[PDB]
Amino acid sequence: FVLELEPEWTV
Amino acid sequence: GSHSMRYFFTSVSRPGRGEPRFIAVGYVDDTQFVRFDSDAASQRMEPRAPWIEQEGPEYWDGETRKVKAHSQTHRVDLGTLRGYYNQSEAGSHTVQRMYGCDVGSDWRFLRGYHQYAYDGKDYIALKEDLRSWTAADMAAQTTKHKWEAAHVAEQLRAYLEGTCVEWLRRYLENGKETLQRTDAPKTHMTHHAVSDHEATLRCWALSFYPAEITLTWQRDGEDQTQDTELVETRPAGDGTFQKWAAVVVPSGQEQRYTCHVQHEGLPKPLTLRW
Amino acid sequence: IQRTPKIQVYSRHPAENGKSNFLNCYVSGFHPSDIEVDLLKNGERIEKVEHSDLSFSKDWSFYLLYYTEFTPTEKDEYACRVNHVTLSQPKIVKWDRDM
């Protein structure tokens, strides 16, 4: 079950 | 024993044309169970173990959606990192991400992790407390400040301590037949004569699961590391693993030497002797 | 950061001449990920070869398993051929039953 990666979490 | 769920993501920029090559793999312990490859035709998260196939269309839609979101995040990141490091648009570069949770023998949360690399070097990693960041350089410091302001650690911690472990437990039950089974190493020793005065003893561990294993040589009951070779543990290709350890010995003195095998599947360690 | 691949070539099951088996080439410890791996029978490239999905270790270095069905014999020689940016010449590792 993959993380819900929020769009703001770019480097 | 302990268990883990880990995901590995690699994005490689393709400067001449198009989006990065993106490959995602999911593991429970040493068993791959899902994959995504941007070069593949399906454009779906795909099963790679029988026990995950029972998950319904909603699971596969959800995992496909999230893994695509990962790829787009990495696409943006590659552009940002090129700028941070003052690199041209000509070279190919690499982003790698790994995260996951470990649970103990009681299946309760043991630790979580989330690590990120640019061009094969540490960039930013979540610390053991899941509340702070290790930034390797000033570029990653900028990222750290951004992620602190956005409260990334708190939301990652919720996944790593909660969601990750819950789904790990689920997979361990559904895949019980293979995931909760230990395969003890099948062991033997071979003998190879170099000259009249020198011989190599090789101690073999085959067909074992999980991958964690220890092979050690002793001479007259004392550990020997000199004149030994230990190969990296390697996949057999059927889900099990292989390893060997060898020692060079004076011809005729083979009986002095013993190989010792330690593995989860072995209640007591094995001893082998020529 | 450029790391040269380690190579092991080996069989899935204990090798017996005239009996079907699987030939493996495990490549690890390399960076970047772009790599060319061929399995050879008597110097000639084997065609049906598959490989695992790219993954990596704690130190970020990549690993891949390349594999194909094969029947060893006494006459036939098998090998793995690897090219990578870190290598000036292709690296050829011959298969031996005892390793």
mmCIF file of C-alpha atoms in Angstrom:
data_model
loop_
_atom_site.group_PDB
_atom_site.id
_atom_site.type_symbol
_atom_site.label_atom_id
_atom_site.label_comp_id
_atom_site.label_asym_id
_atom_site.label_seq_id
_atom_site.Cartn_x
_atom_site.Cartn_y
_atom_site.Cartn_z
ATOM 1 C CA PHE A 1 0.000 0.000 0.000
ATOM 2 C CA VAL A 2 1.760 3.087 -1.403
ATOM 3 C CA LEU A 3 2.023 6.458 0.410
ATOM 4 C CA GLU A 4 -0.510 9.192 -0.460
ATOM 5 C CA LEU A 5 2.182 11.594 -1.664
ATOM 6 C CA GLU A 6 0.708 15.134 -1.431
ATOM 7 C CA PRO A 7 1.400 17.391 -4.477
ATOM 8 C CA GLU A 8 3.262 20.027 -2.421
ATOM 9 C CA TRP A 9 5.950 17.510 -1.335
ATOM 10 C CA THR A 10 8.323 18.199 -4.254
ATOM 11 C CA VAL A 11 11.944 19.004 -3.312
ATOM 12 C CA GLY B 1 10.855 -12.883 13.347
ATOM 13 C CA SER B 2 10.596 -9.240 12.269
ATOM 14 C CA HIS B 3 8.909 -8.125 9.034
ATOM 15 C CA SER B 4 9.042 -5.126 6.708
ATOM 16 C CA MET B 5 7.181 -3.452 3.853
ATOM 17 C CA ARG B 6 9.400 -1.343 1.590
ATOM 18 C CA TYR B 7 8.900 0.566 -1.640
ATOM 19 C CA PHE B 8 11.761 1.540 -3.974
ATOM 20 C CA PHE B 9 11.401 4.213 -6.682
ATOM 21 C CA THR B 10 13.895 5.169 -9.392
ATOM 22 C CA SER B 11 13.446 8.030 -11.873
ATOM 23 C CA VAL B 12 16.051 8.640 -14.598
ATOM 24 C CA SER B 13 15.756 11.807 -16.719
ATOM 25 C CA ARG B 14 15.802 11.452 -20.512
ATOM 26 C CA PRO B 15 17.033 14.874 -21.691
ATOM 27 C CA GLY B 16 16.700 14.482 -25.483
ATOM 28 C CA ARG B 17 12.967 13.733 -25.388
ATOM 29 C CA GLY B 18 10.106 12.764 -23.065
ATOM 30 C CA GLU B 19 9.464 11.978 -19.398
ATOM 31 C CA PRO B 20 11.873 10.177 -17.045
ATOM 32 C CA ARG B 21 12.140 6.395 -16.951
ATOM 33 C CA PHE B 22 10.245 5.500 -13.751
ATOM 34 C CA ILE B 23 10.426 2.094 -12.003
ATOM 35 C CA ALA B 24 8.661 1.305 -8.704
ATOM 36 C CA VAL B 25 8.894 -1.972 -6.767
ATOM 37 C CA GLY B 26 7.181 -3.048 -3.542
ATOM 38 C CA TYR B 27 8.493 -5.738 -1.184
ATOM 39 C CA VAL B 28 7.246 -7.575 1.869
ATOM 40 C CA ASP B 29 10.448 -8.808 3.549
ATOM 41 C CA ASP B 30 12.477 -10.298 0.651
ATOM 42 C CA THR B 31 9.446 -10.935 -1.603
ATOM 43 C CA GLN B 32 8.599 -8.502 -4.392
ATOM 44 C CA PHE B 33 4.803 -8.187 -4.703
ATOM 45 C CA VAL B 34 4.126 -5.209 -7.015
ATOM 46 C CA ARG B 35 5.797 -3.224 -9.779
ATOM 47 C CA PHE B 36 5.297 -0.216 -12.013
ATOM 48 C CA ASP B 37 7.442 0.469 -15.078
ATOM 49 C CA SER B 38 6.804 3.558 -17.219
ATOM 50 C CA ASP B 39 8.168 1.658 -20.286
ATOM 51 C CA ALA B 40 5.568 -1.153 -19.857
ATOM 52 C CA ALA B 41 2.279 -1.204 -21.793
ATOM 53 C CA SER B 42 -0.295 -1.471 -18.972
ATOM 54 C CA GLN B 43 0.522 1.810 -17.166
ATOM 55 C CA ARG B 44 -0.864 0.084 -14.040
ATOM 56 C CA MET B 45 0.629 -1.091 -10.773
ATOM 57 C CA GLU B 46 1.015 -4.827 -11.584
ATOM 58 C CA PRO B 47 1.026 -7.895 -9.267
ATOM 59 C CA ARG B 48 4.238 -9.929 -8.836
ATOM 60 C CA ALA B 49 3.067 -12.403 -6.132
ATOM 61 C CA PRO B 50 -0.107 -14.588 -6.074
ATOM 62 C CA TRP B 51 -1.307 -13.360 -2.632
ATOM 63 C CA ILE B 52 -1.766 -9.720 -3.838
ATOM 64 C CA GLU B 53 -3.994 -10.764 -6.811
ATOM 65 C CA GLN B 54 -7.020 -11.194 -4.481
ATOM 66 C CA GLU B 55 -7.040 -7.384 -3.988
ATOM 67 C CA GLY B 56 -9.911 -5.804 -5.956
ATOM 68 C CA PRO B 57 -10.097 -3.238 -8.824
ATOM 69 C CA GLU B 58 -10.282 -0.383 -6.261
ATOM 70 C CA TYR B 59 -6.893 -1.418 -4.825
ATOM 71 C CA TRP B 60 -5.283 -1.485 -8.270
ATOM 72 C CA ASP B 61 -6.836 1.885 -9.236
ATOM 73 C CA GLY B 62 -5.638 3.433 -5.951
ATOM 74 C CA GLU B 63 -2.085 2.061 -6.228
ATOM 75 C CA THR B 64 -1.838 3.031 -9.906
ATOM 76 C CA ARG B 65 -3.030 6.594 -9.092
ATOM 77 C CA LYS B 66 -0.554 7.013 -6.217
ATOM 78 C CA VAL B 67 2.469 5.520 -8.050
ATOM 79 C CA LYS B 68 1.778 7.798 -11.059
ATOM 80 C CA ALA B 69 1.680 10.745 -8.634
ATOM 81 C CA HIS B 70 5.128 9.599 -7.378
ATOM 82 C CA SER B 71 6.448 9.604 -10.966
ATOM 83 C CA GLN B 72 5.166 13.159 -11.561
ATOM 84 C CA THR B 73 6.675 14.347 -8.263
ATOM 85 C CA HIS B 74 10.038 12.889 -9.372
ATOM 86 C CA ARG B 75 9.644 14.531 -12.822
ATOM 87 C CA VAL B 76 9.294 17.945 -11.146
ATOM 88 C CA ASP B 77 12.124 17.127 -8.697
ATOM 89 C CA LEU B 78 14.547 16.322 -11.510
ATOM 90 C CA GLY B 79 13.974 19.829 -12.957
ATOM 91 C CA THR B 80 14.310 21.468 -9.531
ATOM 92 C CA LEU B 81 17.500 19.556 -8.649
ATOM 93 C CA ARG B 82 19.123 20.422 -11.991
ATOM 94 C CA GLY B 83 18.576 24.085 -11.028
ATOM 95 C CA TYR B 84 19.754 23.684 -7.406
ATOM 96 C CA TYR B 85 23.021 22.087 -8.605
ATOM 97 C CA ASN B 86 23.495 24.390 -11.646
ATOM 98 C CA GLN B 87 23.535 21.483 -14.116
ATOM 99 C CA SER B 88 22.824 21.665 -17.856
ATOM 100 C CA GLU B 89 19.814 20.173 -19.670
ATOM 101 C CA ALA B 90 22.209 17.765 -21.487
ATOM 102 C CA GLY B 91 22.940 15.094 -18.839
ATOM 103 C CA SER B 92 20.744 12.297 -17.492
ATOM 104 C CA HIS B 93 20.238 12.347 -13.723
ATOM 105 C CA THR B 94 18.678 10.035 -11.149
ATOM 106 C CA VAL B 95 16.234 10.417 -8.266
ATOM 107 C CA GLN B 96 15.825 7.482 -5.865
ATOM 108 C CA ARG B 97 13.290 7.172 -3.047
ATOM 109 C CA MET B 98 12.871 4.350 -0.525
ATOM 110 C CA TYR B 99 10.405 4.223 2.348
ATOM 111 C CA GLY B 100 8.721 1.637 4.528
ATOM 112 C CA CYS B 101 8.089 0.248 7.992
ATOM 113 C CA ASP B 102 9.540 -2.574 10.095
ATOM 114 C CA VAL B 103 7.513 -4.549 12.622
ATOM 115 C CA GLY B 104 8.867 -6.915 15.292
ATOM 116 C CA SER B 105 7.898 -10.549 15.932
ATOM 117 C CA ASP B 106 4.719 -9.272 17.636
ATOM 118 C CA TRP B 107 3.761 -7.516 14.311
ATOM 119 C CA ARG B 108 3.791 -4.120 16.104
ATOM 120 C CA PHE B 109 5.544 -1.034 14.702
ATOM 121 C CA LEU B 110 9.318 -1.148 15.226
ATOM 122 C CA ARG B 111 10.670 1.621 12.962
ATOM 123 C CA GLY B 112 9.920 3.697 9.866
ATOM 124 C CA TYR B 113 12.080 5.307 7.211
ATOM 125 C CA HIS B 114 11.946 7.571 4.207
ATOM 126 C CA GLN B 115 15.178 8.244 2.315
ATOM 127 C CA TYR B 116 15.795 10.275 -0.878
ATOM 128 C CA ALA B 117 18.883 10.437 -3.147
ATOM 129 C CA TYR B 118 20.008 12.503 -6.135
ATOM 130 C CA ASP B 119 22.579 10.934 -8.498
ATOM 131 C CA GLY B 120 23.311 8.083 -6.087
ATOM 132 C CA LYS B 121 24.193 10.311 -3.102
ATOM 133 C CA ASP B 122 22.239 11.075 0.088
ATOM 134 C CA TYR B 123 19.981 14.091 -0.392
ATOM 135 C CA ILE B 124 17.392 14.101 2.420
ATOM 136 C CA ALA B 125 16.241 11.438 4.900
ATOM 137 C CA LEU B 126 13.680 11.285 7.689
ATOM 138 C CA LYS B 127 15.373 10.718 11.073
ATOM 139 C CA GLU B 128 14.617 7.734 13.353
ATOM 140 C CA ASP B 129 12.144 9.770 15.453
ATOM 141 C CA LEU B 130 10.079 10.468 12.267
ATOM 142 C CA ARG B 131 9.894 14.139 13.377
ATOM 143 C CA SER B 132 13.050 15.677 11.829
ATOM 144 C CA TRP B 133 15.232 15.570 8.717
ATOM 145 C CA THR B 134 18.843 14.865 7.759
ATOM 146 C CA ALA B 135 19.799 17.138 4.823
ATOM 147 C CA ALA B 136 23.202 16.290 3.332
ATOM 148 C CA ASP B 137 23.988 19.681 1.741
ATOM 149 C CA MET B 138 22.639 23.214 1.241
ATOM 150 C CA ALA B 139 20.304 22.146 -1.597
ATOM 151 C CA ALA B 140 18.698 19.532 0.657
ATOM 152 C CA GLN B 141 18.590 22.172 3.456
ATOM 153 C CA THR B 142 16.290 24.245 1.240
ATOM 154 C CA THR B 143 14.095 21.150 0.776
ATOM 155 C CA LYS B 144 14.160 20.490 4.553
ATOM 156 C CA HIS B 145 12.856 24.023 5.278
ATOM 157 C CA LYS B 146 10.095 23.606 2.649
ATOM 158 C CA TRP B 147 9.051 20.229 4.071
ATOM 159 C CA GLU B 148 9.120 21.562 7.654
ATOM 160 C CA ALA B 149 6.795 24.441 6.645
ATOM 161 C CA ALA B 150 4.454 21.928 4.930
ATOM 162 C CA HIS B 151 4.499 19.497 7.933
ATOM 163 C CA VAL B 152 5.614 16.577 5.729
ATOM 164 C CA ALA B 153 7.173 14.613 8.629
ATOM 165 C CA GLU B 154 3.880 14.443 10.610
ATOM 166 C CA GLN B 155 1.936 13.058 7.637
ATOM 167 C CA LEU B 156 4.749 10.616 6.717
ATOM 168 C CA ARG B 157 4.846 9.477 10.371
ATOM 169 C CA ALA B 158 1.092 8.741 10.276
ATOM 170 C CA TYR B 159 1.634 6.532 7.210
ATOM 171 C CA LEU B 160 4.791 4.860 8.567
ATOM 172 C CA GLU B 161 3.402 4.175 12.077
ATOM 173 C CA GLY B 162 -0.201 3.465 11.032
ATOM 174 C CA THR B 163 -1.132 2.786 7.413
ATOM 175 C CA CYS B 164 2.146 1.039 6.480
ATOM 176 C CA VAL B 165 1.995 -1.409 9.416
ATOM 177 C CA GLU B 166 -1.755 -2.103 8.960
ATOM 178 C CA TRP B 167 -1.308 -3.090 5.307
ATOM 179 C CA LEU B 168 1.897 -5.038 6.122
ATOM 180 C CA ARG B 169 -0.118 -7.115 8.651
ATOM 181 C CA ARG B 170 -2.829 -7.618 6.019
ATOM 182 C CA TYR B 171 -0.305 -8.859 3.436
ATOM 183 C CA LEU B 172 1.390 -11.164 5.970
ATOM 184 C CA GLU B 173 -1.974 -12.870 6.693
ATOM 185 C CA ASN B 174 -3.178 -13.064 3.067
ATOM 186 C CA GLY B 175 0.227 -14.397 1.930
ATOM 187 C CA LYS B 176 0.724 -16.619 5.011
ATOM 188 C CA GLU B 177 1.595 -19.781 3.019
ATOM 189 C CA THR B 178 4.804 -18.197 1.660
ATOM 190 C CA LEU B 179 5.391 -15.004 3.689
ATOM 191 C CA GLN B 180 5.170 -16.664 7.141
ATOM 192 C CA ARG B 181 7.107 -19.783 6.027
ATOM 193 C CA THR B 182 10.879 -20.034 6.563
ATOM 194 C CA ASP B 183 12.934 -22.170 4.184
ATOM 195 C CA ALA B 184 16.055 -23.396 5.951
ATOM 196 C CA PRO B 185 19.284 -23.448 3.953
ATOM 197 C CA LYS B 186 20.116 -26.664 2.132
ATOM 198 C CA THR B 187 23.815 -27.049 2.962
ATOM 199 C CA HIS B 188 26.812 -28.994 1.681
ATOM 200 C CA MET B 189 30.582 -28.650 1.346
ATOM 201 C CA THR B 190 32.755 -29.034 -1.761
ATOM 202 C CA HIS B 191 36.505 -29.648 -2.001
ATOM 203 C CA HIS B 192 38.815 -28.212 -4.695
ATOM 204 C CA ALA B 193 42.565 -29.050 -4.943
ATOM 205 C CA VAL B 194 44.729 -26.087 -6.059
ATOM 206 C CA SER B 195 48.064 -27.902 -5.795
ATOM 207 C CA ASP B 196 49.615 -30.802 -3.854
ATOM 208 C CA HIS B 197 49.795 -28.525 -0.767
ATOM 209 C CA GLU B 198 46.658 -26.308 -0.943
ATOM 210 C CA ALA B 199 42.910 -27.053 -1.021
ATOM 211 C CA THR B 200 39.760 -24.899 -1.030
ATOM 212 C CA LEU B 201 36.736 -25.890 1.059
ATOM 213 C CA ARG B 202 33.484 -24.222 -0.026
ATOM 214 C CA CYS B 203 30.458 -24.260 2.277
ATOM 215 C CA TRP B 204 27.159 -23.813 0.416
ATOM 216 C CA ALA B 205 23.795 -22.463 1.629
ATOM 217 C CA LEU B 206 21.047 -22.900 -0.973
ATOM 218 C CA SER B 207 17.316 -22.459 -1.407
ATOM 219 C CA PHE B 208 16.806 -20.397 1.777
ATOM 220 C CA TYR B 209 14.282 -17.738 2.812
ATOM 221 C CA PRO B 210 14.456 -15.093 4.155
ATOM 222 C CA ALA B 211 17.729 -13.733 2.720
ATOM 223 C CA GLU B 212 19.373 -12.952 6.095
ATOM 224 C CA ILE B 213 22.064 -15.581 6.810
ATOM 225 C CA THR B 214 25.461 -15.930 8.513
ATOM 226 C CA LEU B 215 28.214 -18.286 7.303
ATOM 227 C CA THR B 216 31.416 -18.510 9.341
ATOM 228 C CA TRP B 217 34.496 -20.742 9.295
ATOM 229 C CA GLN B 218 36.365 -22.000 12.360
ATOM 230 C CA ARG B 219 39.739 -23.751 12.660
ATOM 231 C CA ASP B 220 40.084 -25.983 15.748
ATOM 232 C CA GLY B 221 36.970 -24.273 17.208
ATOM 233 C CA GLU B 222 38.195 -20.677 16.675
ATOM 234 C CA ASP B 223 36.767 -18.202 14.113
ATOM 235 C CA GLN B 224 38.921 -17.785 11.008
ATOM 236 C CA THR B 225 38.565 -14.867 8.587
ATOM 237 C CA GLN B 226 42.026 -14.978 6.962
ATOM 238 C CA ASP B 227 42.172 -16.976 3.716
ATOM 239 C CA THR B 228 38.361 -16.908 3.432
ATOM 240 C CA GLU B 229 36.002 -15.591 0.761
ATOM 241 C CA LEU B 230 32.309 -14.834 1.349
ATOM 242 C CA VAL B 231 30.134 -13.980 -1.702
ATOM 243 C CA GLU B 232 27.218 -11.543 -1.615
ATOM 244 C CA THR B 233 23.887 -13.264 -0.917
ATOM 245 C CA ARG B 234 22.211 -13.750 -4.299
ATOM 246 C CA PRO B 235 18.704 -14.542 -5.607
ATOM 247 C CA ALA B 236 18.121 -18.036 -7.036
ATOM 248 C CA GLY B 237 15.210 -16.695 -9.161
ATOM 249 C CA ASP B 238 12.523 -18.914 -7.566
ATOM 250 C CA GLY B 239 12.105 -16.601 -4.525
ATOM 251 C CA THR B 240 14.890 -18.250 -2.460
ATOM 252 C CA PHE B 241 18.489 -17.159 -1.893
ATOM 253 C CA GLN B 242 21.996 -18.567 -2.121
ATOM 254 C CA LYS B 243 25.341 -17.927 -0.484
ATOM 255 C CA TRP B 244 28.701 -19.597 -0.054
ATOM 256 C CA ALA B 245 31.802 -19.141 2.082
ATOM 257 C CA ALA B 246 35.179 -20.645 1.217
ATOM 258 C CA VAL B 247 38.452 -21.200 3.067
ATOM 259 C CA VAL B 248 41.918 -22.121 1.772
ATOM 260 C CA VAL B 249 43.530 -24.860 3.884
ATOM 261 C CA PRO B 250 46.705 -26.967 3.917
ATOM 262 C CA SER B 251 46.061 -30.221 2.045
ATOM 263 C CA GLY B 252 45.442 -33.011 4.597
ATOM 264 C CA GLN B 253 44.184 -30.640 7.346
ATOM 265 C CA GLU B 254 40.563 -30.343 6.099
ATOM 266 C CA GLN B 255 39.154 -31.946 9.300
ATOM 267 C CA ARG B 256 40.344 -28.979 11.432
ATOM 268 C CA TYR B 257 37.870 -26.683 9.658
ATOM 269 C CA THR B 258 34.152 -26.317 10.303
ATOM 270 C CA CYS B 259 31.509 -24.212 8.592
ATOM 271 C CA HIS B 260 28.734 -22.750 10.763
ATOM 272 C CA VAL B 261 25.359 -21.758 9.332
ATOM 273 C CA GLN B 262 22.924 -19.476 11.183
ATOM 274 C CA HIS B 263 19.430 -18.844 9.802
ATOM 275 C CA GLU B 264 15.872 -18.210 11.131
ATOM 276 C CA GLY B 265 14.692 -21.545 9.692
ATOM 277 C CA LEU B 266 17.386 -23.386 11.724
ATOM 278 C CA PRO B 267 16.376 -23.866 15.415
ATOM 279 C CA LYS B 268 20.047 -24.609 16.231
ATOM 280 C CA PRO B 269 22.936 -23.504 13.972
ATOM 281 C CA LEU B 270 24.351 -26.174 11.623
ATOM 282 C CA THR B 271 27.955 -27.351 11.646
ATOM 283 C CA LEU B 272 29.541 -28.892 8.528
ATOM 284 C CA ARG B 273 32.927 -30.654 8.326
ATOM 285 C CA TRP B 274 34.875 -32.273 5.475
ATOM 286 C CA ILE C 1 28.938 9.130 -8.422
ATOM 287 C CA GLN C 2 29.861 6.143 -10.618
ATOM 288 C CA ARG C 3 30.100 2.604 -9.213
ATOM 289 C CA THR C 4 31.284 -0.438 -11.199
ATOM 290 C CA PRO C 5 29.033 -3.542 -11.270
ATOM 291 C CA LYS C 6 29.829 -6.702 -9.325
ATOM 292 C CA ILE C 7 28.900 -9.839 -11.292
ATOM 293 C CA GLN C 8 28.009 -13.367 -10.192
ATOM 294 C CA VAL C 9 27.086 -16.002 -12.776
ATOM 295 C CA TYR C 10 25.499 -19.178 -11.433
ATOM 296 C CA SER C 11 22.687 -21.715 -11.771
ATOM 297 C CA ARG C 12 19.364 -21.691 -9.926
ATOM 298 C CA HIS C 13 19.645 -25.422 -9.080
ATOM 299 C CA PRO C 14 22.652 -27.737 -8.645
ATOM 300 C CA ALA C 15 24.109 -28.192 -12.115
ATOM 301 C CA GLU C 16 23.790 -31.595 -13.787
ATOM 302 C CA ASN C 17 24.861 -32.033 -17.409
ATOM 303 C CA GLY C 18 21.936 -32.859 -19.719
ATOM 304 C CA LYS C 19 19.253 -31.674 -17.256
ATOM 305 C CA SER C 20 17.211 -28.463 -17.524
ATOM 306 C CA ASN C 21 18.101 -25.562 -15.236
ATOM 307 C CA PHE C 22 18.238 -21.745 -15.104
ATOM 308 C CA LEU C 23 21.325 -19.603 -15.805
ATOM 309 C CA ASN C 24 21.590 -16.451 -13.688
ATOM 310 C CA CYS C 25 23.675 -13.310 -13.984
ATOM 311 C CA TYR C 26 23.317 -11.165 -10.863
ATOM 312 C CA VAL C 27 24.674 -7.632 -11.326
ATOM 313 C CA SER C 28 24.894 -5.350 -8.288
ATOM 314 C CA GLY C 29 26.643 -2.377 -6.718
ATOM 315 C CA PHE C 30 26.428 -0.172 -9.836
ATOM 316 C CA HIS C 31 25.484 3.445 -10.588
ATOM 317 C CA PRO C 32 24.086 4.887 -12.807
ATOM 318 C CA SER C 33 21.285 2.394 -13.637
ATOM 319 C CA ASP C 34 21.771 2.234 -17.439
ATOM 320 C CA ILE C 35 23.487 -1.094 -18.092
ATOM 321 C CA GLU C 36 23.767 -3.760 -20.808
ATOM 322 C CA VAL C 37 23.757 -7.419 -19.725
ATOM 323 C CA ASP C 38 23.915 -10.417 -22.074
ATOM 324 C CA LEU C 39 24.041 -14.146 -21.399
ATOM 325 C CA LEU C 40 26.340 -16.026 -23.791
ATOM 326 C CA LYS C 41 26.366 -19.637 -25.040
ATOM 327 C CA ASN C 42 29.740 -20.420 -26.684
ATOM 328 C CA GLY C 43 30.351 -16.684 -27.224
ATOM 329 C CA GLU C 44 26.980 -16.084 -28.946
ATOM 330 C CA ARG C 45 24.238 -13.926 -27.382
ATOM 331 C CA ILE C 46 21.231 -15.845 -25.989
ATOM 332 C CA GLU C 47 17.944 -14.267 -27.130
ATOM 333 C CA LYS C 48 15.075 -15.105 -24.734
ATOM 334 C CA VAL C 49 16.695 -13.452 -21.662
ATOM 335 C CA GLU C 50 14.513 -11.852 -18.951
ATOM 336 C CA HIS C 51 15.420 -9.657 -15.979
ATOM 337 C CA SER C 52 14.109 -8.479 -12.604
ATOM 338 C CA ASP C 53 12.641 -5.038 -11.923
ATOM 339 C CA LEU C 54 15.323 -2.462 -11.076
ATOM 340 C CA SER C 55 15.876 -2.025 -7.346
ATOM 341 C CA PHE C 56 18.679 -0.778 -5.112
ATOM 342 C CA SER C 57 20.484 -1.278 -1.826
ATOM 343 C CA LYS C 58 20.958 0.888 1.292
ATOM 344 C CA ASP C 59 23.938 2.667 -0.354
ATOM 345 C CA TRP C 60 21.746 3.536 -3.419
ATOM 346 C CA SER C 61 23.612 1.134 -5.741
ATOM 347 C CA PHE C 62 21.441 -0.808 -8.192
ATOM 348 C CA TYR C 63 20.946 -4.537 -8.652
ATOM 349 C CA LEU C 64 19.384 -6.704 -11.377
ATOM 350 C CA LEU C 65 18.986 -10.427 -12.023
ATOM 351 C CA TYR C 66 19.196 -11.571 -15.652
ATOM 352 C CA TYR C 67 18.133 -15.154 -16.287
ATOM 353 C CA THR C 68 17.232 -17.758 -18.891
ATOM 354 C CA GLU C 69 16.402 -21.456 -19.081
ATOM 355 C CA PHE C 70 19.411 -23.598 -20.068
ATOM 356 C CA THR C 71 20.654 -27.186 -20.135
ATOM 357 C CA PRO C 72 24.331 -27.378 -19.174
ATOM 358 C CA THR C 73 26.636 -29.899 -20.864
ATOM 359 C CA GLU C 74 30.362 -30.673 -20.638
ATOM 360 C CA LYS C 75 31.049 -29.151 -24.093
ATOM 361 C CA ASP C 76 29.051 -25.898 -23.843
ATOM 362 C CA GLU C 77 30.486 -22.760 -22.225
ATOM 363 C CA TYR C 78 28.210 -20.153 -20.629
ATOM 364 C CA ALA C 79 29.037 -16.597 -19.596
ATOM 365 C CA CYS C 80 27.648 -13.204 -18.672
ATOM 366 C CA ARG C 81 28.743 -10.072 -20.571
ATOM 367 C CA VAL C 82 28.265 -6.654 -18.952
ATOM 368 C CA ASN C 83 28.838 -3.161 -20.321
ATOM 369 C CA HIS C 84 28.490 -0.048 -18.178
ATOM 370 C CA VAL C 85 29.869 3.531 -18.332
ATOM 371 C CA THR C 86 32.466 2.593 -15.649
ATOM 372 C CA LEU C 87 33.971 -0.133 -17.889
ATOM 373 C CA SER C 88 36.431 0.610 -20.726
ATOM 374 C CA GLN C 89 36.054 -2.985 -22.032
ATOM 375 C CA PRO C 90 32.998 -5.265 -21.660
ATOM 376 C CA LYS C 91 33.345 -7.519 -18.585
ATOM 377 C CA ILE C 92 32.897 -11.230 -19.349
ATOM 378 C CA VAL C 93 32.504 -13.656 -16.426
ATOM 379 C CA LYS C 94 32.411 -17.345 -17.356
ATOM 380 C CA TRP C 95 29.995 -19.670 -15.589
ATOM 381 C CA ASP C 96 31.615 -22.345 -13.401
ATOM 382 C CA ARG C 97 29.618 -25.061 -11.590
ATOM 383 C CA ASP C 98 31.575 -24.658 -8.319
ATOM 384 C CA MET C 99 30.739 -20.922 -7.777
#
